[PDB]
Amino acid sequence: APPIMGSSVYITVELAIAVLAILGNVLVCWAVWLNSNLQNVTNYFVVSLAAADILVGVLAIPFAITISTGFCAACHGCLFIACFVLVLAQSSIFSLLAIAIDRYIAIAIPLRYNGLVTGTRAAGIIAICWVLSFAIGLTPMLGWNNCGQPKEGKAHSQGCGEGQVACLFEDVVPMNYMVYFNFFACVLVPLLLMLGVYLRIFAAARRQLADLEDNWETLNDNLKVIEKADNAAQVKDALTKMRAAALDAQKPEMKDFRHGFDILVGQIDDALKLANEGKVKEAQAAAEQLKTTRNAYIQKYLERARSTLQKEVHAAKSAAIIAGLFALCWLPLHIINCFTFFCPDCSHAPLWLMYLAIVLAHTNSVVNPFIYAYRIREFRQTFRKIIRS
Numbered sequence: 001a002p003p004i005m006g007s008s009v010y011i012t013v014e015l016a017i018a019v020l021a022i023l024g025n026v027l028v029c030w031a032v033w034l035n036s037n038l039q040n041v042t043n044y045f046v047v048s049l050a051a052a053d054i055l056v057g058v059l060a061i062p063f064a065i066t067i068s069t070g071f072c073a074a075c076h077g078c079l080f081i082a083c084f085v086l087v088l089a090q091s092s093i094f095s096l097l098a099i100a101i102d103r104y105i106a107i108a109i110p111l112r113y114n115g116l117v118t119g120t121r122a123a124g125i126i127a128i129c130w131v132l133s134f135a136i137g138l139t140p141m142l143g144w145n146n147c148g149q150p151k152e153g154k155a156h157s158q159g160c161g162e163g164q165v166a167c168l169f170e171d172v173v174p175m176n177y178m179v180y181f182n183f184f185a186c187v188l189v190p191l192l193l194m195l196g197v198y199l200r201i202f203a204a205a206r207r208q209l210a211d212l213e214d215n216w217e218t219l220n221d222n223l224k225v226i227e228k229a230d231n232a233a234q235v236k237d238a239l240t241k242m243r244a245a246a247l248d249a250q251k252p253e254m255k256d257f258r259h260g261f262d263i264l265v266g267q268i269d270d271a272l273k274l275a276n277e278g279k280v281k282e283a284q285a286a287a288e289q290l291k292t293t294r295n296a297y298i299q300k301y302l303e304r305a306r307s308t309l310q311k312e313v314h315a316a317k318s319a320a321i322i323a324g325l326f327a328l329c330w331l332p333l334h335i336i337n338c339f340t341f342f343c344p345d346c347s348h349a350p351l352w353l354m355y356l357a358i359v360l361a362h363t364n365s366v367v368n369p370f371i372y373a374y375r376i377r378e379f380r381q382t383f384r385k386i387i388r389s
């Protein structure tokens with residue numbers, strides 16, 4: 001069958017992907033620019049990620065359409081056309097890893113997050129990562145290429161000029177670069193690092209949430225021991241334990257919460273002094289006042305701390321879905337390259353499967369705006385306003 005028929009389907013799908021990638025991620029950038037509630041360090045890497053996806057539609061997809069034709073070109077010009085998408089993929093990887101690290105810092109050390117993770121430092125990290133992406137992705141242009149050994153018979157059959165080659169990806173980009181350097185070192189290792197970071201984030205969240213519940217139970221259990229205690233020493237043992245737990249849990253709403261813990265510790269000290277004097281009944285009656293503080297203050301702190309953690313678990317899952325989708329989207333093309341490289345006795349993957357793998361990789365530049373709309377309310381609402389207005 002004529003090559004332009006099969007090409008037409010591939011080309012049309014590529015253009016449709018390019019349009020969607022541009023529109024969706026331009027909307028992401030426009031939402032962050034307009035909504036100050038979306039202007040945080042986490043969303044600065046989201047914008048950098050969206051910028052890479054906009055460049056996929058504007059440049060990488062037209063480059064992929066061009067290189068599918070095998071047109072005659074100077075080999076190093078062809079290399080740029082072949083490698084630029086690797087720059088964008090590398091940048092995306094850096095942004096995805098930065099988002100994962102950012103969410104770990106926020107959940108593991110929230111008391112020092114604002115002082116450690118700032119917008120100015122984030123912009124500096126984004127700039128460095130872009131420079132690194134260019135270096136990694138354009139490494140073939142540094143000499144790790146096949147331009148020294150051009151397919152002369154293919155170039156002559158296509159009427160290429162002297163010094164030109166038929167511009168095809170696998171003719172100019174070495175497969176040992178694609179598999180060992182790009183896939184294994186620069187894609188697989190960072191993705192396994194993100195998985196590691198995500199596991200730590202979820203484990204930290206779970207651990208925190210049994211700590212909140214453990215403290216709620218413990219306060220309640222120690223109130224029961226005091227009620228059915230029969231001597232002053234037992235009341236003292238329970239109160240002593242309580243006081244330590246109250247200070248451990250203390251480490252508009254913040255003013256009433258600090259006042260709630262000032263009442264709690266003070267009421268524990270009142271009953272402790274009565275227990276040390278041997279006045280058991282008085283100590284017990286004083287410890288009963290703690291239930292008033294628990295209902296009006298402590299329980300509200302427990303449902304708000306728990307609520308905050310849930311929101312973090314939710315936000316970490318949304319970010320992990322984005323990283324997972326990147327892996328799902330790019331792995332097929334990388335796995336095919338592994339078969340091409342590691343099995344010279346296997347027939348090369350057919351052209352239609354190469355096209356399918358390539359389009360799948362490009363579809364990843366479309367999916368992120370939909371994940372933000374379906375999982376993050378502040379993005380969703382902002383998208384509605386932009387579209388309406």
Ligand SMILES: CC(C)CCC[C@@H](C)[C@H]1CC[C@H]2[C@@H]3CC=C4C[C@@H](O)CC[C@]4(C)[C@H]3CC[C@]12C
Binds near residue numbers: 073076
């Ligand atoms: C700012 C943005 C829009 C600029 C985009 C510039 C792009 C399209 C330019 C920059 C470098 C250019 C390449 C430089 C070298 C060659 C070799 C030549 O034998 C065929 C064209 C080809 C492959 C060019 C294609 C167009 C090209 C890729």
Ligand SMILES: CC(C)CCC[C@@H](C)[C@H]1CC[C@H]2[C@@H]3CC=C4C[C@@H](O)CC[C@]4(C)[C@H]3CC[C@]12C
Binds near residue numbers: 074076080
């Ligand atoms: C931000 C501005 C400066 C754009 C920078 C891009 C320019 C400087 C780069 C990008 C790609 C480069 C080209 C890539 C490959 C080739 C083919 C080679 O046979 C001659 C040089 C030539 C044609 C390069 C010239 C310089 C070039 C056009």
Ligand SMILES: CC(C)CCC[C@@H](C)[C@H]1CC[C@H]2[C@@H]3CC=C4C[C@@H](O)CC[C@]4(C)[C@H]3CC[C@]12C
Binds near residue numbers: 328332336350
């Ligand atoms: C990451 C998830 C989606 C798994 C993706 C699995 C895909 C990429 C795997 C599964 C089966 C694989 C194919 C199995 C057998 C062959 C025949 C060989 O002569 C060329 C490669 C080729 C055609 C493989 C290409 C890659 C392949 C299609």
Ligand SMILES: CC(C)CCC[C@@H](C)[C@H]1CC[C@H]2[C@@H]3CC=C4C[C@@H](O)CC[C@]4(C)[C@H]3CC[C@]12C
Binds near residue numbers: 339
């Ligand atoms: C954590 C996971 C996603 C790591 C990625 C797994 C990759 C690296 C694995 C999965 C399946 C593997 C392929 C399975 C079968 C063959 C055929 C053999 O003749 C050469 C190696 C080759 C081509 C393997 C190369 C590596 C491979 C592509």
Ligand SMILES: CCCCCCCC/C=C\CCCCCCCC(=O)OC[C@H](O)CO
Binds near residue numbers: 063065
């Ligand atoms: C911001 C908007 C961005 C603008 C994006 C524009 C969209 C055009 C898409 C692809 C270009 C590919 C052009 C095709 C190049 C091949 C020409 C050629 O020579 O191929 C014939 C070959 O010789 C036979 O073997």
Ligand SMILES: CCCCCCCC/C=C/CCCCCCCC(=O)O
Binds near residue numbers: 128136
């Ligand atoms: C594939 C090539 C990889 C490149 C390896 C060497 C590059 C090392 C770069 C490190 C970035 C460190 C950040 C330092 C910022 C200082 C900027 C300044 O001078 O003010």
Ligand SMILES: CCCCCCCC/C=C/CCCCCCCC(=O)O
Binds near residue numbers: 347348349350353
């Ligand atoms: C959701 C499941 C995927 C749906 C569509 C995927 C279709 C492509 C799947 C390909 C698996 C194997 C492809 C076989 C290629 C022929 C092997 C050869 O001749 O070398």
Ligand SMILES: Cn1c(=O)c2c(ncn2C)n(C)c1=O
Binds near residue numbers: 082085178337
């Ligand atoms: C990343 N990538 C491509 O972008 C590509 C390709 N073949 C054609 N293109 C465009 N291969 C094998 C590839 O690994």
Ligand code: NA
Binds near residue numbers: 052053364
């Ligand atoms: Na991306």
